[PDB]
C-alpha cells in the first residue's frame, strides 16, 4: 500500500519508519517527532524565528529583535518556492506529519498535551515547510556557520597602532591573530596536499 506508513519502535523507543514514497516517509518522521519532542520543537521554532517574547514576556524582547535582525525571511521563502516537487515533499511531508499529531493533541489535551504547555500557559500551533527549514537555518547556519569579529578586530588593530606606531601595531596584530601558522597540526598530512591560496596580511584594503 502506497497510503500505508508503519512505525516500529525498538527497546529504546527509537522509531523506524517504513513507507513507499517520499511524502509518506517524512510524514512518518514528523509524526514521531511531534510524539517524542513537541515542547522542545516548539521552543526551538520560536527561538529560531524570534517569537519567544509572545509566550515568555519582556525579558526576551532584545533576544527576539537580535534573532530577527540576523536573517531575511523572504530570501528563505524564495528558496523554498524554487524546489522541485520531490524535494518539496520532504519538507511538506514532515510538516504535515507533525500537524497530524498536533491535531490529535489539541483535540484530546487532557491526556496528550505535554505538561510544559500547561506550565508555561500556551498551546502548540501548526507548522509549514518554512518552519522546518528555519529549525536547520537558525541552529546550524545561523548559529554555527556565522562567526566573525571583524569589527572588533579593527578596534584592536587601531589601539595597537596608537600604542606601538603604525608599522609596529600591524606586526603585533599579526603576532596575536596570525592569518596562518605553518606548525598547526592538520587533519590532512602535508604529504597529501596543502592549500593553494595565499592571502594579504597587511590590511591592504585601507
Amino acid at each position: 500500500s502506497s497510503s500505508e506508513i508503519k512505525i516500529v519502535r525498538d527497546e529504546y523507543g527509537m522509531p523506524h519508519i517504513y513507507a513507499n514514497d517520499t511524502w509518506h516517509l517524512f510524514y512518518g518522521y514528523g509524526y514521531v517527532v511531534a510524539q517524542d519532542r513537541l515542547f522542545q520543537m516548539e521552543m526551538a521554532r520560536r527561538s529560531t524565528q524570534g517569537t519567544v517574547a509572545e509566550v515568555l514576556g519582556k525579558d526576551f524582547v532584545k533576544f527576539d529583535k537580535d534573532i530577527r535582525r540576523n536573517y531575511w525571511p523572504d530570501a528563505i521563502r524564495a528558496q523554498i518556492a524554487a524546489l522541485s516537487p520531490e524535494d518539496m515533499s520532504i519538507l511538506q511531508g514532515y510538516a504535515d506529519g507533525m500537524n497530524a499529531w498536533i491535531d490529535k493533541v489539541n483535540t484530546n489535551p487532557e491526556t496528550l498535551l505535554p505538561k510544559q504547555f500547561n506550565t508555561f500557559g500556551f498551546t502548540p500551533k501548526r507548522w509549514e515547510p518554512f518552519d522546518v527549514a528555519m529549525i536547520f537555518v537558525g541552529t546550524m547556519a545561523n548559529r554555527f556557520s556565522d562567526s566573525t569579529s571583524e569589527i572588533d578586530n579593527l578596534a584592536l588593530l587601531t589601539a595597537l597602532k596608537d600604542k606601538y606606531g603604525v608599522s609596529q601595531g600591524m606586526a603585533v596584530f599579526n603576532q596575536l591573530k596570525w592569518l596562518v601558522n605553518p606548525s598547526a597540526p592538520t587533519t590532512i598530512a602535508v604529504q597529501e596536499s596543502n592549500y593553494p591560496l595565499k592571502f594579504n596580511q597587511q590590511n591592504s584594503q585601507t
Binding site: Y29, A53, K177, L197
Partner: protein, 557 residues
C-alpha cells in the same frame, strides 16, 4: 567536536571504524534525535540534532558519515558608505542604491508591542552603523542563498553508496563543516565542506572592507579547492576542530586560532601508539581524551627546565615534581567531588599568572581581557561546552618556543627578562595562592572537580523544559554530546556492519499532563555516565527482533 576514522590498514578485526563525538553542550531533553528511515530509496539508521530531515550521524549499511564544525572564514564585513542627505541609500559602483528594508513587530506577553526596522544591502543585513563616519556595516556570508540546498545535501547524502556519489552531495553543502566517510570495503575519506569567497588581491580577511564596489568578492571558489583526502597514507583521519590542512586560514574570530598547541594532538598520540586498533580500543579513546588535561603536555617541559637548578625544599620545585609524576588523566576521588591529583588546579593558577605577566601586559585596555583566560574557567554547573586550550595560552606557547616558532615575535612578551625568571615568579604566585587555601602538604590537597549539567534551557538561553528537568552528572567529560560508533565488516559477526550510539537523557521528552514521565525519558542517562552504548538496528529482521511496539497509519496526500 571530535572524530576519528580508522581504515583498513589500521583496523583490527574489521575493515573500518568511525567514532564521532559532536560537541554542542548538554541539554534535557537531548540535543539529538534517534530515527531509522526505510523506503523511497532510503535505508538508514542514526541520530541528528533537532530531528532535521537529514541525519548528521549514522549509516546506510554500505557507507557511514559524521561531522565536526569547520571554522573556515566564510563571513566578511562590508563598510557601507552612507549619506547624511538621501538616507536609506548607499554608494555602490558609482551610484546611490536604495536599501532593502522590512518592518517587524515584536508582540510581548504582558507588555506593549515593539516595532523596529531591519536593513539590507547587496552585501547583506546591516549589523551596526556609525553615524559619525556615516558608515553602516553589512555582514556578508558566502552561503547566503544556499541554506535550503545545504539541508537537502545533508538529506540526499544518506543515499550515496560510494565516494563519488557521496562527494557530489558534499559539493552542495555550503556551511563551513567537516564531513567524514567510511565504507564496507574499508575506504575512508574527509572533506572540509562549504562555500568560500573568491577574494580580490590585497583583501585581508580579518578586517572590514569598503562596501563601495572595488572590494566585492569575485565569486565563490570551486569545490576542487576544498581541502579533502581519500584513503590517507597514515591509515586514519582525526579532527577536534583543528586545521584541515597546511596553509588553510581559520575563521577571523579574535579568540580562535590554529597554532602549534592544539588539542587534536591528544587523539593523534593515542592512534599512533598502537599499530592496529579494535572497535573496543577505538571506543576507549573516548574515555581517555574525556579525562585528559590539555595544558600539561604543552608547558611541562618549560616548567621542568626552569626549576631544574632548584633545591628539593623549594616549594616551586615540589609543584613541578607533582606534575612530573602525573599522566594528566583526571579521576574523581570516592567523594564524587574532588580530583585525585591537584595538577589542573596548579596549571590553572600558573597560567593565569603567566598570562597576566606576558600577553595581557602587551595589549592595551580594554582588549587585554580577551587574552587573560586560562581555559579552566567554569561555574558550579560546569563548562557549557568542550574544554580547549585558551587563545592567550596558544599565543604564550609560541613565545616559549623561541625561534622554533614560525610566528615573528614583534613584541617580546617576556619584556627583556629571561623566560625562567618569569616562569619562577608565576610559580611563586601559584604556591602562595594554593598553599594558603589547602596548606603545605601537597599530598593531601583535594581540589574541586568539574561537574556536568544537562540544561533545561536550549543553547540560546530559552527554556525547552521546566527548570526541575535539569540533570546533573558528577564527572565532567570532555566528549561528544552524543557518541556513535560504526564498524564495517566485523570478523566477529556475520553482519556486514555493526553500529552503536547513546542519546541521553533518552529518546523521549514526553511528560503527560498528570506528570507521568514517558518510559524512554531517562533510560540512557546512566549509560552515558559509564561510557556504555546501545546497538543501532538497520535491517528489518533486527528491527522486528527488537520491536517493543508498532503503529500503522493510512493516509492519502
Amino acid at each position: 567536536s571530535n572524530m576519528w576514522v580508522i581504515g583498513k590498514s589500521k583496523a583490527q578485526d574489521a575493515k573500518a571504524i568511525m567514532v564521532n563525538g559532536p560537541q554542542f553542550g548538554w541539554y534535557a531533553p537531548a540535543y539529538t534525535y534517534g530515527i531509522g528511515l526505510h523506503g523511497a530509496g532510503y535505508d538508514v539508521t542514526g541520530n541528528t540534532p533537532f530531528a532535521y530531515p537529514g541525519l548528521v550521524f549514522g549509516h546506510n549499511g554500505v557507507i557511514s558519515w559524521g561531522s565536526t564544525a569547520g571554522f573556515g572564514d566564510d563571513v566578511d564585513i562590508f563598510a557601507e558608505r552612507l549619506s547624511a542627505e538621501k538616507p536609506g541609500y548607499y554608494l555602490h559602483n558609482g551610484k546611490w542604491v536604495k536599501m532593502l528594508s522590512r518592518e517587524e513587530t515584536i508582540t510581548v506577553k504582558n507588555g506593549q508591542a515593539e516595532t523596529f526596522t531591519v536593513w539590507r544591502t547587496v552585501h547583506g543585513n546591516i549589523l551596526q552603523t556609525d553615524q559619525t563616519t556615516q558608515t553602516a556595516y553589512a555582514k556578508s556570508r558566502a552561503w547566503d542563498g544556499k541554506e535550503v540546498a545545504s539541508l537537502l545535501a545533508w538529506t540526499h547524502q544518506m543515499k550515496a553508496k560510494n565516494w563519488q556519489q557521496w562527494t557530489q552531495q558534499a559539493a552542495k553543502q555550503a556551511l563551513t563543516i567537516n564531513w567524514y566517510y567510511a565504507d564496507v570495503n574499508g575506504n575512508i575519506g574527509y572533506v572540509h565542506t562549504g562555500a568560500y569567497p573568491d577574494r580580490q588581491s590585497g583583501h585581508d580577511p580579518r578586517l572590514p572592507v569598503p562596501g563601495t564596489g572595488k572590494w566585492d568578492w569575485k565569486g565563490l571558489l570551486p569545490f576542487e579547492m576544498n581541502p579533502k583526502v581519500y584513503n590517507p597514507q597514515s591509515g586514519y583521519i582525526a579532527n577536534w576542530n583543528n586545521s584541515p590542512q597546511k596553509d588553510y586560514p581559520a575563521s577571523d574570530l579574535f579568540a580562535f586560532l590554529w597554532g602549534g598547541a592544539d588539542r587534536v594532538t591528544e587523539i593523534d598520540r593515542l592512534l599512533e601508539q598502537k599499530p592496529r586498533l579494535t572497535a573496543d580500543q577505538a571506543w576507549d579513546v573516548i574515555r581517555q581524551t574525556s579525562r585528559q588535561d590539555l595544558n600539561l603536555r604543552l608547558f611541562l617541559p618549560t616548567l621542568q627546565a626552569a626549576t631544574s637548578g632548584l633545591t628539593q625544599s623549594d616549594p616551586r620545585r615540589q609543584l613541578v615534581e607533582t606534575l612530573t609524576r602525573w599522566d594528566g588523566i583526571n579521576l574523581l576521588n570516592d567523594d564524587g567531588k574532588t580530583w585525585q591529583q591537584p595538577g589542573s588546579a596548579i596549571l590553572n593558577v600558573w597560567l593565569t599568572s603567566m598570562l597576566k605577566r606576558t600577553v595581557v601586559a602587551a595589549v592595551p585596555m580594554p582588549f587585554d581581557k580577551w587574552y587573560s583566560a586560562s581555559g579552566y574557567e567554569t561555574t558550579q554547573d560546569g563548562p557549557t561546552g568542550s574544554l580547549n586550550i585558551s587563545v592567550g595560552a596558544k599565543i604564550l606557547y609560541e613565545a616559549v618556543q623561541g625561534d622554533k616558532s614560525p610566528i615573528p615575535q614583534a613584541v617580546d612578551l617576556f619584556a627583556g627578562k629571561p623566560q625562567q625568571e618569569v616562569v619562577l615568579a608565576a610559580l611563586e604566585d601559584t604556591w602562595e595562592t594554593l598553599s594558603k587555601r589547602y596548606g603545605n602538604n601537597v599530598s593531601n590537597w583535594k581540589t574541586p572537580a568539574m561537574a556536568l549539567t544537562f540544561r533545561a534551557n536550549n543553547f540560546f538561553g530559552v527554556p525547552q523544559a521546566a527548570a526541575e528537568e535539569t540533570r546533573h552528572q558528577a564527572e565532567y567529560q570532555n566528549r561528544g554530546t552524543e557518541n556513535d560508533m560504526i564498524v564495517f565488516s566485523p570478523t566477529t559477526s556475520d553482519r556486514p556492519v555493526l553500529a552503536w550510539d547513546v542519546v541521553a537523557p533518552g529518546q523521549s521528552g514526553f511528560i503527560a499532563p498528570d506528570g507521568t514521565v514517558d518510559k524512554h525519558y531517562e533510560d540512557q542517562l546512566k549509560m552515558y555516565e559509564n561510557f556504555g552504548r546501545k546497538s543501532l538496528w538497520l535491517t528489518k529482521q533486527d528491527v522486528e527482533a527488537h520491536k517493543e511496539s508498532q503503529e500503522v497509519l493510512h493516509v492519502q496526500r
